[PDB]
Amino acid sequence: MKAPVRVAVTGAAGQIGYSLLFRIAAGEMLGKDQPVILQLLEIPQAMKALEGVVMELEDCAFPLLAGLEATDDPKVAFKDADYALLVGAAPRKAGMERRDLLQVNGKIFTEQGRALAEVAKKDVKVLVVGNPANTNALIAYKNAPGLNPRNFTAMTRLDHNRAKAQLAKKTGTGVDRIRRMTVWGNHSSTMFPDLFHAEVDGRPALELVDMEWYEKVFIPTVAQRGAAIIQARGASSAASAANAAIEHIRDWALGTPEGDWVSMAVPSQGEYGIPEGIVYSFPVTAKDGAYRVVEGLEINEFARKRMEITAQELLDEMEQVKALGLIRKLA
Amino acid sequence: MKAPVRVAVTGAAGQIGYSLLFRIAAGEMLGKDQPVILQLLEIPQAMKALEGVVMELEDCAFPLLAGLEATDDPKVAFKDADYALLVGAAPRKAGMERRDLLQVNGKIFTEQGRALAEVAKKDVKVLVVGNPANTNALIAYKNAPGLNPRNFTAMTRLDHNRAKAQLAKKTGTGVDRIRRMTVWGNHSSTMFPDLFHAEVDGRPALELVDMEWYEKVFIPTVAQRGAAIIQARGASSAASAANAAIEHIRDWALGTPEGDWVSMAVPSQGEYGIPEGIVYSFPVTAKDGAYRVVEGLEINEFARKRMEITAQELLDEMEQVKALGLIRK
């Protein structure tokens, strides 16, 4: 009964894409009743590989895959898009330093932001996965005049899920009984996983674990988890990143469970005193493609200090992209 | 909710495994009401990577993942297993001839068949994915005394799906309207994709495409599709292979759609005159862990010829393993 929606995915031949696209086409992101048209973008040098990924998608005989098109043109990939998952960012290349990376990312997200504003649905839901996600999302929305800034988000859901997994393991409880986890701030080493409002089968997390464990073990382990995957596998955490992306879009589009919330990095409107405009991870609830920051939560000194550190890092990143003229102003 | 089932997967840190485990844990193989305990096997040198895969699975916070354990011991991985997906086979190392590969696979699938027979559930459902799948399944079940040979299968579902995809493309129809595709025989270059019974939106396939296209374009293209993916991506078709494994198990454990059938390589009981014992792909319907070959189908000359060629290849393969004393002569 449902008309197809168009889902654009960039970096489509890369490792995250390879773990992402099949689950999307299977109906895992937007529902088993929702046909999808996949509009896939790569850089020119990866188009040959992308055509291979297209063949594999065909070879799954997915009943919900109502359309499938690969392109190297963002204005084609984003045409009439209902969702856009911006996975492809500047590749790490030998010789490239931070400022070089910033400029390449600046070009990518300026171009993609502009393309989205020109050709996508006005209510396109955008998720930036490619690193540095929060600041790339800022560049994208600032260069998408005519689109609601709050339709641009960045992914902290992988950190959020990692935090839930660590808490479940420590408390010996099923991860499905962990609620109200929050990761605040930047998708970076300064992220703040918040246990002060989290619940384990209805019980406050900090009645089951102590502050020493929280500070000395939990926080660093969540921060280092991406590195841990690389050390073990010799490859980055593509499958769990793809899972997190699916969950981020799914919970935004289909809604968060009653009594629970999720983490999403979204343009700040001053909630919790976070500077307006920076893309900052907040606890949020969602219903029908719209989300709201969960306000009213008590913030103690431990939390405030960490929320402020990560806010400042985001402000520093913003100043650097402002200095490169990638955005005019934060406000 | 259903009581949890134990799903064993070998080669669990490899490419097919990486595309397979997350969708199993998400409930895509056995249903959204079916919790799964994943019991993962790797060779010792891959255990470090497998622990990394374990961490990634944890980091997905899957509500249905009721247990998760990694091991290098088949008797641990297969313990109380309800399903066993045998993905890891002999790796292609420089300097190894076919005979060397056969010896290594013989060891692997003898050991795993014996382990399954010793420690898995008596009704464990087994799917061999690792190449050469049909013959590896033969070695496995022949060395699995006390287990129903009919519970040992090999995967031709990827060829099946590729065939449906090609027919949908050619006819300009949705792949969801392709029914009754069959791939017969070996998962090899001699496999036979059968359009004589296939239907496109209820219409016989061969009323929409002609025999010239079938023989000259369709068959070679399905046969070469794995090579096509490698040439394009620089890597094998891991994600679509994983998808095919999931569907093979899903349609077997749950059931095939009314009026439709799927392809599964199963130990032959002489259906269609196919020699007995060899693991051969047939059209089958299934439900609740049991399949039945669709019998009574009209087999014309074009089909018969190709069905016999691939049967003979499997017989030759069987004679190879018997001569190495891998199964009883």
Numbering used by the authors:
A (entry chain A): 1 to 331
B (entry chain B): 1 to 329
The publication says:
Malate dehydrogenase (MDH, EC 1.1.1.37) catalyzes a dehydrogenation reaction from malic acid to generate oxaloacetic acid, which is accompanied by reduced NAD generating NADH. MDH from T. thermophilus (TtMDH) is more similar in amino acid sequence to NADP-dependent chloroplastic MDH than NAD-dependent bacterial and mitochondrial MDHs. Similar to other MDHs, a protomer of TtMDH has the N-terminal NAD binding domain and C-terminal catalytic domain and consists of 12 helices and 11 β-strands.
The crystallographic asymmetric unit contains two subunits, which forms a homodimer arranged through a noncrystallographic two-fold axis and is consistent with the observation of analytical gel filtration chromatography. The two subunits are virtually superimposable, with a root mean square deviation (RMSD) of 0.124 Å between the corresponding Cα atoms of the two subunits. Two monomers are further assembled into a dimer via reciprocal interactions from helices α1, α2, α7, α8, α9, α10, and α11. The dimeric interface is about 1619 Å2 and involves 18 hydrogen bonds and extensive hydrophobic interaction, as analyzed by PDBsum. The overall B-factor of the crystal structure color coded as defined in Figure 4C is quite low, which indicates the high stability of TtMDH. Conversely, the loop region between β4 and α4 reveals higher B-factor values, considered to be involved in conformational changes with NAD binding. However, electron densities in the apo-form crystals were of high quality and generally continuous, so the residues of the entire sequence could be modeled into the structure. Even the electron densities of the loop regions for NAD binding are clearly shown.
